């Protein structure tokens, strides 16, 4: 019984950390375009004056 639940909880933690990997990659691309947007705001104001 013991090893089947260790891998029956092991592989599940693995799967939602696969989630976690995708998820923080989303955070990566997110703050990336965030800083891109901050730079766009900066230059549009620096152009307007």
């Amino acid at each position: 019984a013991a090893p089947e639940r260790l891998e029956a909880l092991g592989e599940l933690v693995d799967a939602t950390k696969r989630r976690e990997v995708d998820l923080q990659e989303r955070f990566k691309a997110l703050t990336r375009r965030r800083d891109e947007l901050a730079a766009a705001l900066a230059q549009k104001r620096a152009a307007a004056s």
Partner: protein, 318 residues
């Protein structure tokens, strides 16, 4: 007699590697775990087999000063050697010939790390406070960032876009190379918490964790996940030592992230269990400061390199 559960195929559970004629400053296991690249103070690289003789089947020469840091390239046939003679060198392992010698740095090229996923690219940080990124097939350096204080330890991240550099300036920095195509980029992340210089940097086997050995006699574990708490500091290890030698004492993760090994100046091979943050193995046997420790790619084998011209090569029992 004593029959304690032989882990590896090595003839014995503790093997000393001799043949060097200087301090051994950095070592590395082949990705396929059957080679040793040992770089000594004698400006020479010994290539050992990990099994069946431990035969140093080749001594590659060509640096004019101590080869401070060695990694292997992702396929294991090309080697990246970094030295004090201001020259980093790419060699072919099977052959005994040097492939590409780039010497763009002005002072001792302390630290280097070749990228593990992507192209044949390696970072090198030297005494000029500049951390430079080097692509294999171009003969110019592809990137060059300038800190103000001599670079001691550098690593390339798991994913391949940022560079970690830590030195005498009491703070380790993470820089973004694609964010920087200019010659005076400013640092992205400032991991603080070491109380003096950083000496060694290892990227975790998942890439979310960075290990820093400090002459703060402290191993610190930080997380590099772009979504972190305000303090990226996770773990602290006590136990090893740094002394007046100020050697390049490094970090390593076990191939599983389960242990962390540090080289120390008290001649001891330290191996902590990362989770409980406590000392699993404290192996004696080295007569000089332990410079770098490397965990064998497959088995729990640990091999250490010291400033005593030898390398102990053995397996862990518990």
């Amino acid at each position: 007699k004593e029959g304690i559960t032989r882990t590896s195929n090595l003839s014995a559970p503790i093997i000393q590697l001799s043949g060097h004629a200087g301090e051994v400053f950095s070592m590395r296991f082949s990705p396929d775990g059957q080679c040793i690249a040992s770089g000594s103070f004698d400006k020479t690289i010994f290539l050992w087999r990990t099994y069946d003789e431990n035969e140093n089947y080749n001594v590659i020469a060509g640096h004019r000063n101590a080869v401070l840091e060695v990694h292997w390239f992702t396929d294991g046939e090309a080697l990246l050697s970094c030295s004090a003679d201001k020259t980093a060198r790419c060699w072919d392992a099977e052959t005994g010939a040097p492939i590409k010698k780039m010497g763009e740095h002005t002072a001792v090229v302390n630290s280097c790390c070749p990228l593990r996923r992507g192209a044949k690219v390696f970072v090198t940080g030297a005494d000029d406070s500049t951390v430079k990124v080097w692509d294999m097939r171009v003969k110019k350096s592809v990137h060059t960032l300038r800190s103000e204080f001599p670079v001691c330890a550098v690593a390339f991240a798991d994913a391949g876009d940022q560079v970690y550099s830590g030195g005498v300036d009491n703070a380790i920095k993470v820089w973004d190379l694609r964010r920087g195509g200019g010659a005076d980029v400013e640092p992205s992340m400032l991991l603080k918490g070491h109380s003096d210089s950083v000496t060694g940097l290892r990227v975790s086997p998942d890439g979310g964790h960075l290990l820093s050995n400090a002459m703060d006699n402290t191993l610190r574990e930080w997380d590099v996940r772009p979504y972190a708490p305000p303090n990226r500091c996770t773990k602290v290890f006590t136990g090893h030592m740094h002394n007046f030698e100020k050697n390049l004492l490094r970090c390593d993760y076990a191939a599983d992230g389960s242990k962390v090994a540090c080289g120390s100046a008290d001649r001891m091979v330290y191996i902590w269990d990362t989770s409980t943050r406590k000392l699993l193995y404290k192996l004696p046997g080295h007569s000089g400061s332990v410079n770098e420790v490397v965990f064998h790619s497959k088995e729990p084998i640990v091999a250490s390199a010291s400033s005593d011209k030898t390398i102990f090569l053995g397996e862990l029992t518990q």
